[PDB]
Each structure stands twice: as C-alpha cells, then as structure tokens.
C-alpha cells in the first residue's frame with residue numbers, strides 16, 4: 001500500500017517541500033498568499049499564483065488497475081474590498097500531470113487554457129469561483145467540480161463571509177468513485193456540501209502533482225485576496 | 240414538481256406537526272428529548288423514543304420512474320455521564336414505510352428487529368452509533384449508512400465532544416444516487432464526511448414517513464442523552 005501524506009499547520013518561508021509558481025508567496029507570518037497584495041495592502045488585479053507539493057503522488061496503477069483514495073483539508077480566506085468592478089476570479093485545489101507550469105489566469109484559474117472539455121488536460125479540480133464567466137452558472141461564489149474543463153460538471157452556490165476563514169474537506173473514495181467536498185465557515189456556522197461520481201482512471205495520469213492555484217481579474221481592480229493558512233493531504237494506493 | 244418542506248428552529252410543546260412515539264418528549268425550553276431523562280436529571284437506560292413528521296413524503300413515483308432529491312439538517316447533543324458501563328446506544332435519521340411504530344430498541348435503535356439485511360424493512364437510515372455491537376466496527380462513536388439493515392454499508396468514526404452541539408447535513412442527489420452526510424462540531428471545529436451510492440428505488444416505498452429515533456442501553460446506566468434542537472427537511476420530486 002503506498003501512502004503519501006503531508007500537513008502544513010502554517011507555511012514556513014524558504015521550505016523546500018513546496019514549489020511556488022507565478023505570484024505565489026509565503027509571508028513571514030506563515031500564510032500562503034496565492035495572488036499578489038500591493039504595497040498599500042490591497043489585492044492586485046491580473047495576478048496568478050500556484051503552489052504544488054514537491055513530490056508526485058501515485059494515484060492509480062495501470063498494471064493492477066488499483067486507484068488511490070485520498071483526502072485533503074485546507075483553510076483559506078477571500079477579502080473583496082471594492083464594490084465595483086466585480087471581484088474575480090477564485091482559487092482551485094487541483095491534480096494534473098507532473099511538472100506542470102501555470103496555464104491561463106483569470107477565469108481559467110491558472111489551470112486551463114480555454115473553455116473546452118479536452119481530455120489532454122488530464123486535470124481534476126475543485127474550484128471556489130467568485131466571478132461568473134459565460135460558462136458559469138449565474139450565481140457566484142460557487143464550489144464547482146472540474147473534470148478536464150473549467151465548465152464544471154456540478155456546481156453548489158455558497159455565500160462568502162468576507163475575509164473570514166473557510167475550512168474545506170475534499171475526500172475521494174476509490175471504491176465508490178465518489179468525490180465529496182465540504183466547505184464550512186466557523187464564523188457563521190454555514191455548511192455547504194457537493195458530491196459527484198468521478199472515475200479518476202478516465203481523467204488523470206498514474207502520477208500527478210497536487211496543488212492550489214488562484215487568480216485575480218482581467219480589468220483594473222477586479223481583484224480579491226486568496227490566502228491559505230494550512231493544507232494537509234493523504235493518499236493511499238492499495239498496492 | 241411536488242415539494243415538501245419544514246423547518247423547526249426550536250420545538251413547540253403540543254404542536255401537531257410531529258408524531259411523538261415511545262419516550263420522546265418536547266420540553267418547555269423547546270428541545271426534543273428523544274430518550275428519557277429522570278427526575279434527578281440523568282438519562283434513563285432502557286428507553287426508546289422517536290419523532291416522525293406528520294405528513295408522508297413522496298420520494299419516487301413508479302409510473303414515471305422519477306425519484307426525489309432531498310436534504311435534511313439537524314442539531315443534537317449527546318452527554319455521557321458515567322465512565323462505566325459503556326454508554327449506549329445512539330440516534331438515527333430514518334425514512335421508511337408510512338404509519339410505522341417503534342421496532343426494537345437498544346442497538347437496533349428503534350427501527351430494526353434483528354441484524355439481518357431484509358428487504359421487507361424498506362428503511363434507509365443515517366446513524367450516530369455510540370455502542371459497538373457484534374455487527375459494528377470496533378470504533379465508536381461512528382456515523383453509519385444503513386440500508387435495510389443495522390449492519391451499515393459504510394461507517395465513519397468520529398470523536399464525541401461530550402454535551403456539545405453537533406450540526407448534521409444529509410443530502411441525496413437523485414441523479415447521481417449519492418447520499419452524502421456531514422457532521423460538524425462548532426466547538427472544536429471538527430468536520431467528518433461520509434458518502435455512498437444508494438438507489439432509493441431499490442429500498443424505499445413510493446411514500447415514506449421521515450423521522451429521528453434514539454435509544455439507550457440494555458443494562459443499568461448504559462445511557463446518554465439524545466437531545467435535538469432544530470430539524471429542517473426539503474424534498475423535490477421532478478413530477
């Protein structure tokens with residue numbers, strides 16, 4: 001059974017277990033800022049940042065056909081400081097091909113290049129989308145399950161509690177092929193849930209890099225923060 | 240589309256929208272005590288109590304083959320006051336045949352009569368089991384999904400935060416046939432999740448009564464409270 005596990009209760013500047021890409025940065029206070037915050041302390045527009053765990057994870061084995069069960073938990077906050085233009089774009093927890101670089105930002109969230117459903121993406125993502133693009137449902141923010149496309153196969157609207165910490169739990173049970181995610185805001189006590197069937201063998205490569213990506217908007221000040229406070233992950237391949 | 244919905248932010252003594260059975264009682268303070276609390280304020284052993292919503296709900300239609308999607312949310316607390324004997328037995332959210340009466344108590348939780356998997360039960364339940372019976376996993380307490388048997392098809396251990404309020408969300412998406420449940424303890428911030436595939440058409444009658452049932456143990460003082468503070472439910476049949 002090969003297992004891989006990690007827990008960052010806080011982020012350490014300079015640690016070598018995380019690959020930071022784009023605007024991503026760890027502050028001296030221990031928080032991971034996925035998108036840029038300016039000198040005056042406000043979120044910068046046109047920013048994309050990602051953080052990938054530095055070891056690939058063996059998610060399924062073609063020789064035996066077994067696939068791993070996994071769980072990830074993370075805490076984040078989004079602060080939207082201006083009434084207009086509308087804030088944008090959101091953050092995503094994703095799994096895809098190893099050694100990837102950032103793709104398009106804005107509504108593609110640093111992981112897709114257009115809005116087609118293309119099997120060559122080989123990407124699974126759980127988004128927290130704050131801007132309604134032509135491919136989105138009208139309600140934002142929303143949690144969405146993305147399978148080889150920014151056009152989610154399932155969406156769940158949620159209300160943002162501005163600048164408050166949200167706790168996320170995403171679990172995948174390989175036997176039932178069920179991906180279930182929960183978002184809880186301790187401040188208001190709000191609980192949101194989403195679940196869909198996803199057979200990972202049809203989507204992902206055998207080895208994947210796991211990460212978080214965030215992006216701000218395409219026009220001046222269409223921005224918000226995408227701060228992450230802790231992140232843990234565990235995966236077990238019955239092999 | 241026929242919908243049925245209800246929300247009790249608190250329980251009103253004497254309201255006629257709830258059928259109370261066994262030891263079940265609503266206090267003047269608005270809480271639903273599923274099992275008996277003695278004069279000295281401690282939970283009584285050998286007690287079984289249930290509360291059913293007074294209108295049946297149309298869960299699936301044989302003529303069109305459509306099945307309803309539903310969601311229920313409730314808050315409860317369990318207080319276990321003695322170190323020995325082990326506390327028992329737990330509470331369950333259930334759906335089954337209309338006009339039912341309490342079945343066996345103790346580990347059967349007021350809804351089964353033995354530990355066989357019998358299709359004539361026609362019962363779906365999500366339990367919060369506090370005592371490990373011969374049919375249980377060794378870890379208690381645990382959340383379990385029961386389909387025509389007290390022998391759960393899926394189990395998830397959780398740690399009890401004694402006497403604290405737990406918030407539960409159970410959702411069923413008819414399209415994917417996914418039953419997903421979440422338990423959150425606001426006090427510790429603990430989040431537990433369980434999900435399994437359940438095709439309701441193979442289990443339930445077309446019309447069901449929905450309820451909550453609780454039971455205490457078979458020997459002196461193997462007991463705990465099973466207090467419910469609020470309960471809401473909504474179901475929609477695309478018909």
Ligand SMILES: OC[C@H]1O[C@@H](O[C@H]2[C@H](O)[C@@H](O)[C@H](O)O[C@@H]2CO)[C@H](O)[C@@H](O)[C@H]1O
Nearest residue numbers: 085088089106107131216217218219222
């Ligand atoms: O406004 C944030 C939002 O912008 C979209 O891009 C717009 C851009 O803002 C606008 O100035 C330009 O004329 O056309 C673009 C076409 O939509 C992004 O696509 C969206 O993701 C957000 O970033």
Ligand SMILES: OC[C@H]1O[C@@H](O[C@H]2[C@H](O)[C@@H](O)[C@H](O)O[C@@H]2CO)[C@H](O)[C@@H](O)[C@H]1O
Nearest residue numbers: 324327328345346370455456457458461
């Ligand atoms: O102790 C609570 C526990 O009791 C089980 O029943 C026991 C009973 O306690 C014991 O005194 C008797 O000799 O045998 C019974 C067989 O197990 C219940 O089955 C269980 O659900 C709890 O209620």
Ligand SMILES: [Ca+2]
Nearest residue numbers: 107129131133
């Ligand atoms: Ca979007």
Ligand SMILES: [Ca+2]
Nearest residue numbers: 346368370372
């Ligand atoms: Ca039991």
Ligand SMILES: [Mn+2]
Nearest residue numbers: 129136144152
């Ligand atoms: Mn979206």
Ligand SMILES: [Mn+2]
Nearest residue numbers: 368375383391
């Ligand atoms: Mn059990």
